[PDB]
Short mmCIF file of C-alpha atoms and ligand atoms in Angstrom, two decimals:
data_model
loop_
_atom_site.label_atom_id
_atom_site.label_comp_id
_atom_site.label_asym_id
_atom_site.label_seq_id
_atom_site.Cartn_x
_atom_site.Cartn_y
_atom_site.Cartn_z
CA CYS A 1 -35.56 -39.91 34.80
CA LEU A 2 -34.77 -36.50 34.43
CA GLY A 3 -38.11 -34.66 33.75
CA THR A 4 -39.22 -30.95 32.67
CA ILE A 5 -35.18 -30.41 32.66
CA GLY A 6 -34.35 -31.81 29.95
CA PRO A 7 -30.84 -34.15 29.51
CA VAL A 8 -28.62 -31.42 28.87
CA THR A 9 -27.20 -29.53 32.22
CA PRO A 10 -25.00 -26.80 31.72
CA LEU A 11 -21.67 -26.36 33.43
CA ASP A 12 -20.16 -23.26 32.63
CA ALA A 13 -19.91 -21.09 29.67
CA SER A 14 -18.70 -24.15 27.41
CA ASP A 15 -19.07 -27.38 28.66
CA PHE A 16 -22.57 -29.28 30.38
CA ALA A 17 -23.54 -32.53 31.78
CA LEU A 18 -24.91 -34.75 28.88
CA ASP A 19 -27.74 -37.90 30.44
CA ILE A 20 -27.70 -40.43 28.15
CA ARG A 21 -30.75 -42.72 29.89
CA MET A 22 -32.94 -45.73 29.19
CA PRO A 23 -36.70 -44.10 28.44
CA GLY A 24 -38.43 -45.57 30.90
CA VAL A 25 -37.98 -50.15 29.69
CA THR A 26 -39.30 -52.77 31.06
CA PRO A 27 -37.42 -55.83 30.04
CA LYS A 28 -39.34 -59.22 28.82
CA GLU A 29 -37.40 -62.23 29.83
CA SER A 30 -34.26 -63.24 31.96
CA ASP A 31 -30.30 -61.12 29.90
CA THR A 32 -31.56 -58.79 27.78
CA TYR A 33 -29.91 -56.34 25.98
CA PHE A 34 -30.56 -52.63 25.84
CA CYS A 35 -29.38 -50.42 23.51
CA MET A 36 -30.62 -46.41 22.68
CA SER A 37 -28.69 -43.37 20.97
CA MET A 38 -28.09 -39.09 21.33
CA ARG A 39 -27.50 -37.35 18.54
CA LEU A 40 -24.19 -34.83 19.72
CA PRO A 41 -26.45 -31.02 20.81
CA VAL A 42 -23.21 -29.68 19.34
CA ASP A 43 -22.53 -30.39 16.09
CA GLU A 44 -18.96 -28.04 16.69
CA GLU A 45 -16.12 -30.55 17.90
CA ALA A 46 -16.25 -31.61 21.74
CA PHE A 47 -14.41 -33.13 24.96
CA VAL A 48 -16.13 -35.55 26.57
CA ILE A 49 -13.55 -35.48 29.92
CA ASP A 50 -15.48 -36.99 32.34
CA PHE A 51 -18.13 -40.34 32.67
CA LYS A 52 -20.54 -40.06 35.38
CA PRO A 53 -22.28 -44.07 36.16
CA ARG A 54 -25.82 -43.42 37.02
CA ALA A 55 -26.89 -47.13 37.45
CA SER A 56 -29.51 -49.18 40.07
CA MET A 57 -26.87 -50.91 41.97
CA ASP A 58 -29.61 -53.97 42.20
CA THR A 59 -30.56 -55.20 38.88
CA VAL A 60 -27.73 -53.68 36.23
CA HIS A 61 -25.09 -55.92 35.93
CA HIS A 62 -23.22 -54.17 33.05
CA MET A 63 -23.30 -51.09 30.80
CA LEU A 64 -21.18 -48.96 27.72
CA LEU A 65 -21.17 -46.51 26.00
CA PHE A 66 -19.99 -45.71 22.22
CA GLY A 67 -19.96 -43.73 19.55
CA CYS A 68 -20.91 -43.90 15.74
CA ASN A 69 -22.41 -41.97 13.04
CA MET A 70 -24.89 -44.62 12.21
CA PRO A 71 -26.38 -45.92 15.62
CA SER A 72 -28.32 -49.33 15.00
CA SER A 73 -31.69 -48.53 15.11
CA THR A 74 -34.18 -45.34 15.27
CA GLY A 75 -36.22 -45.93 17.64
CA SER A 76 -36.42 -45.05 20.93
CA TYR A 77 -35.03 -48.31 22.82
CA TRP A 78 -33.77 -50.96 20.56
CA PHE A 79 -32.63 -55.06 20.83
CA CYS A 80 -28.95 -55.21 20.32
CA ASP A 81 -29.78 -58.13 18.86
CA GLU A 82 -30.10 -56.00 16.10
CA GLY A 83 -26.62 -54.65 16.49
CA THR A 84 -25.55 -50.81 18.26
CA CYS A 85 -24.17 -48.76 14.88
CA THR A 86 -23.85 -50.03 11.66
CA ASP A 87 -20.44 -48.54 10.97
CA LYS A 88 -17.70 -48.67 13.55
CA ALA A 89 -18.75 -48.58 17.38
CA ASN A 90 -15.64 -46.40 19.36
CA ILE A 91 -16.65 -47.66 23.05
CA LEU A 92 -15.89 -44.68 25.21
CA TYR A 93 -17.20 -46.33 29.00
CA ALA A 94 -17.81 -49.23 30.41
CA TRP A 95 -19.19 -50.10 34.06
CA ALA A 96 -18.93 -52.96 36.02
CA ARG A 97 -20.71 -53.19 39.28
CA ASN A 98 -17.67 -56.23 40.99
CA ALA A 99 -15.25 -54.18 39.47
CA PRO A 100 -15.28 -50.60 40.29
CA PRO A 101 -15.04 -47.64 36.90
CA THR A 102 -11.18 -46.28 36.69
CA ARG A 103 -11.35 -42.04 35.56
CA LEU A 104 -9.75 -40.58 32.74
CA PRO A 105 -6.78 -38.11 33.66
CA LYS A 106 -6.66 -35.29 33.88
CA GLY A 107 -6.08 -33.47 29.83
CA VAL A 108 -7.47 -36.46 28.70
CA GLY A 109 -10.13 -36.26 27.26
CA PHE A 110 -12.09 -38.33 23.73
CA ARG A 111 -12.50 -36.25 20.75
CA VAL A 112 -16.24 -35.73 19.70
CA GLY A 113 -17.79 -33.81 17.64
CA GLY A 114 -16.85 -31.89 14.35
CA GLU A 115 -15.71 -32.92 10.90
CA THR A 116 -14.83 -35.72 12.14
CA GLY A 117 -15.49 -37.59 15.90
CA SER A 118 -18.78 -39.24 16.96
CA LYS A 119 -22.14 -38.07 16.42
CA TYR A 120 -23.90 -39.81 18.76
CA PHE A 121 -23.52 -41.43 21.12
CA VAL A 122 -25.03 -45.21 22.00
CA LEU A 123 -25.93 -46.75 25.73
CA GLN A 124 -25.80 -50.32 26.09
CA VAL A 125 -27.27 -51.62 29.18
CA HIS A 126 -27.40 -55.37 30.38
CA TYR A 127 -29.95 -56.77 32.93
CA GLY A 128 -29.48 -59.60 33.99
CA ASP A 129 -31.52 -61.19 36.73
CA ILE A 130 -35.04 -59.58 35.65
CA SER A 131 -36.72 -60.90 39.42
CA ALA A 132 -36.06 -58.26 40.84
CA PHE A 133 -38.54 -56.27 39.22
CA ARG A 134 -41.26 -57.24 41.34
CA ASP A 135 -43.30 -54.72 39.05
CA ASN A 136 -42.88 -53.24 36.13
CA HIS A 137 -40.89 -49.90 38.09
CA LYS A 138 -39.22 -48.25 34.60
CA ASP A 139 -36.42 -48.29 34.24
CA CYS A 140 -34.27 -45.16 33.25
CA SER A 141 -30.41 -46.04 34.60
CA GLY A 142 -28.12 -45.01 31.65
CA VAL A 143 -24.18 -42.69 31.83
CA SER A 144 -24.16 -38.72 32.77
CA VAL A 145 -21.38 -37.05 30.65
CA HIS A 146 -18.92 -34.37 30.46
CA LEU A 147 -18.72 -32.72 27.66
CA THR A 148 -16.00 -29.19 27.25
CA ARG A 149 -14.96 -27.59 24.30
CA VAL A 150 -11.82 -26.54 25.43
CA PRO A 151 -8.69 -27.91 23.33
CA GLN A 152 -7.59 -30.87 25.55
CA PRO A 153 -3.40 -31.36 26.15
CA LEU A 154 -4.14 -34.89 25.33
CA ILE A 155 -6.24 -37.12 23.68
CA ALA A 156 -7.90 -39.93 24.27
CA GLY A 157 -8.26 -43.42 21.79
CA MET A 158 -8.98 -46.98 21.45
CA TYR A 159 -6.55 -49.75 20.03
CA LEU A 160 -8.53 -52.52 19.02
CA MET A 161 -7.82 -56.08 18.27
CA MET A 162 -9.80 -58.47 17.62
CA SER A 163 -9.68 -61.95 15.59
CA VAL A 164 -11.74 -62.45 12.12
CA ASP A 165 -11.16 -65.83 11.00
CA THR A 166 -10.54 -67.85 14.19
CA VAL A 167 -12.43 -71.11 13.99
CA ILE A 168 -12.84 -73.72 17.52
CA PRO A 169 -13.37 -76.81 16.16
CA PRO A 170 -16.50 -78.98 17.95
CA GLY A 171 -14.11 -80.33 22.09
CA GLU A 172 -11.37 -79.23 20.62
CA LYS A 173 -9.78 -78.80 24.27
CA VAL A 174 -7.49 -75.11 23.39
CA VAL A 175 -7.53 -73.21 20.07
CA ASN A 176 -5.25 -69.79 20.32
CA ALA A 177 -6.74 -67.10 18.64
CA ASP A 178 -3.20 -64.92 17.17
CA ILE A 179 -3.53 -60.85 16.53
CA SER A 180 -0.15 -58.87 15.44
CA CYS A 181 0.51 -55.31 14.13
CA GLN A 182 3.21 -53.28 14.38
CA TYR A 183 2.57 -49.97 15.11
CA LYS A 184 2.96 -47.39 12.56
CA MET A 185 1.69 -43.94 14.52
CA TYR A 186 3.15 -41.18 16.74
CA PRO A 187 3.86 -42.18 20.46
CA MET A 188 0.74 -43.85 22.54
CA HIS A 189 0.16 -44.02 26.02
CA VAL A 190 -2.06 -47.44 27.43
CA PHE A 191 -3.32 -46.86 30.84
CA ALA A 192 -6.18 -49.49 31.02
CA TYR A 193 -8.09 -52.96 28.84
CA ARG A 194 -10.85 -54.09 28.10
CA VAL A 195 -11.15 -57.86 26.81
CA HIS A 196 -13.61 -59.60 25.29
CA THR A 197 -15.16 -62.89 24.91
CA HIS A 198 -18.16 -64.91 24.91
CA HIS A 199 -18.30 -68.24 26.91
CA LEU A 200 -16.22 -70.29 25.46
CA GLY A 201 -12.06 -68.03 25.98
CA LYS A 202 -10.96 -68.79 29.41
CA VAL A 203 -7.91 -66.29 29.08
CA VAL A 204 -7.34 -62.77 27.10
CA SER A 205 -3.35 -60.70 27.18
CA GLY A 206 -2.02 -58.19 25.24
CA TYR A 207 1.53 -57.58 24.49
CA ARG A 208 3.63 -55.10 22.88
CA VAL A 209 6.71 -56.14 21.64
CA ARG A 210 9.77 -54.62 21.14
CA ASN A 211 13.14 -55.64 20.13
CA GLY A 212 11.95 -59.35 20.57
CA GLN A 213 10.88 -57.94 24.61
CA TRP A 214 7.41 -58.81 25.50
CA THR A 215 5.49 -55.97 27.78
CA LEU A 216 2.60 -57.19 29.01
CA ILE A 217 -0.14 -54.65 29.00
CA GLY A 218 -3.14 -56.32 29.75
CA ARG A 219 -3.77 -60.02 31.12
CA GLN A 220 -7.69 -61.28 32.55
CA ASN A 221 -10.00 -63.79 32.95
CA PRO A 222 -12.94 -62.83 30.32
CA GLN A 223 -15.99 -64.91 31.92
CA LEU A 224 -14.76 -62.29 34.80
CA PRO A 225 -16.80 -58.84 34.13
CA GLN A 226 -15.57 -57.16 30.95
CA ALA A 227 -15.10 -53.79 32.27
CA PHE A 228 -11.90 -51.20 31.93
CA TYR A 229 -9.32 -52.78 33.50
CA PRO A 230 -6.31 -50.02 34.52
CA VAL A 231 -3.00 -50.68 33.19
CA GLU A 232 -0.34 -50.69 35.96
CA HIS A 233 2.70 -49.52 34.93
CA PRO A 234 2.14 -46.85 31.83
CA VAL A 235 2.90 -48.98 29.00
CA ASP A 236 4.40 -47.01 25.43
CA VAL A 237 3.85 -48.15 22.39
CA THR A 238 6.04 -45.88 19.15
CA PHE A 239 6.41 -46.38 15.34
CA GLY A 240 7.91 -49.95 15.10
CA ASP A 241 6.90 -51.93 17.97
CA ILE A 242 4.37 -54.80 17.24
CA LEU A 243 1.21 -54.61 19.41
CA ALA A 244 0.83 -58.94 19.96
CA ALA A 245 -2.72 -60.89 21.73
CA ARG A 246 -4.31 -63.82 22.53
CA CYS A 247 -7.31 -65.12 23.42
CA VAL A 248 -7.54 -68.90 24.97
CA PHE A 249 -10.40 -71.03 23.69
CA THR A 250 -11.88 -74.23 23.92
CA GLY A 251 -14.62 -75.87 21.38
CA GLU A 252 -15.92 -78.34 25.10
CA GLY A 253 -19.16 -78.64 25.46
CA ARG A 254 -20.46 -78.63 21.71
CA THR A 255 -21.90 -79.85 18.85
CA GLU A 256 -20.61 -78.00 16.40
CA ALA A 257 -17.51 -75.49 15.36
CA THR A 258 -17.76 -71.82 16.30
CA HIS A 259 -15.95 -69.16 15.14
CA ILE A 260 -16.55 -65.53 14.87
CA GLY A 261 -19.70 -63.52 14.67
CA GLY A 262 -22.44 -61.51 17.05
CA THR A 263 -24.65 -64.50 18.11
CA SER A 264 -23.76 -65.44 21.45
CA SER A 265 -23.48 -69.06 19.79
CA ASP A 266 -20.48 -67.87 18.31
CA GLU A 267 -17.12 -66.61 19.38
CA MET A 268 -15.27 -63.26 19.73
CA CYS A 269 -11.65 -62.16 20.04
CA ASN A 270 -11.39 -58.02 21.05
CA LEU A 271 -9.17 -56.77 23.15
CA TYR A 272 -9.18 -52.73 24.05
CA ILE A 273 -6.61 -51.13 24.07
CA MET A 274 -7.70 -47.26 26.02
CA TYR A 275 -4.75 -45.03 25.08
CA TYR A 276 -3.42 -41.63 24.89
CA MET A 277 -2.09 -39.23 22.46
CA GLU A 278 0.26 -35.81 22.35
CA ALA A 279 -3.44 -33.81 21.12
CA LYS A 280 -1.23 -32.66 18.08
CA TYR A 281 -0.54 -36.24 17.03
CA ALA A 282 -3.08 -37.98 18.23
CA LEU A 283 -5.60 -40.29 16.67
CA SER A 284 -8.78 -41.26 18.04
CA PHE A 285 -9.10 -45.06 16.71
CA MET A 286 -6.47 -48.02 15.77
CA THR A 287 -7.46 -51.17 14.69
CA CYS A 288 -5.87 -54.66 13.58
CA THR A 289 -7.42 -58.03 13.12
CA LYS A 290 -4.25 -59.52 10.96
CA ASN A 291 -1.21 -61.85 12.11
CA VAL A 292 1.78 -60.63 10.94
CA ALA A 293 3.81 -62.12 12.73
CA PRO A 294 2.71 -65.92 13.68
CA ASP A 295 6.43 -66.94 13.99
CA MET A 296 6.91 -64.00 16.83
CA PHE A 297 4.31 -66.02 18.71
CA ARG A 298 6.67 -68.50 19.06
CA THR A 299 8.49 -66.78 22.19
CA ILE A 300 4.93 -65.46 23.91
CA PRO A 301 4.86 -65.36 27.88
CA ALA A 302 3.17 -69.03 29.05
CA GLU A 303 1.31 -66.92 31.14
CA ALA A 304 -0.36 -66.37 28.51
CA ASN A 305 -1.88 -70.00 28.37
CA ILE A 306 -2.29 -70.90 31.21
CA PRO A 307 -6.34 -69.34 33.26
CU1 LIG B 401 -23.46 -57.79 31.48
CU1 LIG B 402 -19.35 -59.94 21.48
NA1 LIG B 403 -16.95 -33.79 35.88
NA1 LIG B 404 -25.11 -57.50 20.30
NA1 LIG B 405 -14.15 -49.20 7.48
NA1 LIG B 406 -20.87 -74.71 26.14
NI1 LIG B 407 6.07 -42.71 28.53
#
């Protein structure tokens, strides 16, 4: 816990570290999601060029940091059952125990603040085993974020791919959630990926399709720590390519149909593609919910079907 010196640490003339911590929380039941927000100190446009995790190695499972203009609650801390942000939450950072977080390359920063950038950070901390709190303890875990107002030559962004209409029948052995959009912006370069799914998902796979050629971006089992994993060969996606993604679900162990939604008993098929772009061509966020080329999913690498 910080104390009398507050959450802002000045680094030089135009740099500062902003500590985003929990306000000394104490959970009640096993598996709890706490969320809290931080207005940015600056109104001027700024660049998040670094994150440092400040979490206890014996109690925290995962951490998530978002940028949005309308956080879910105004309270000091809240339960993320009430969601994270009313508007679209732009994910900036993830932390996992078993997955050592990769760093942002130098000259690459998330554009925040200003006219159009995010006005708030929302921190989400998952406390798995509460039995690690023999007493009240009072926990102030969170993220330290490096801000600079020096324009970065490369701007980081997120290309989010998600399913909306996926319906998983009870006991059905395999249900695919296919997603596809054509890319219509300037080149992006993918360097990290994150997959998200609930308890029913078996595998999530992301590709770039160019002239009918499937180029792997990320392939992960979603039941493993859902951190940001680095891409092996850095992939460029350019005007004309089709981004395709498939989550493989199963309906086994369910009495009723499962669809896409917020609750634990609902499902999700998310692939977060963290890219970078030349600052002057850059846009911070892109989204695909469509499946514009379903016929294309015929020539999908078989590897995207087996676990
Ligand atoms: Cu977790
Ligand atoms: Cu979810
Ligand atoms: Na730093
Ligand atoms: Na939630
Ligand atoms: Na919208
Ligand atoms: Na189940
Ligand atoms: Ni390139």
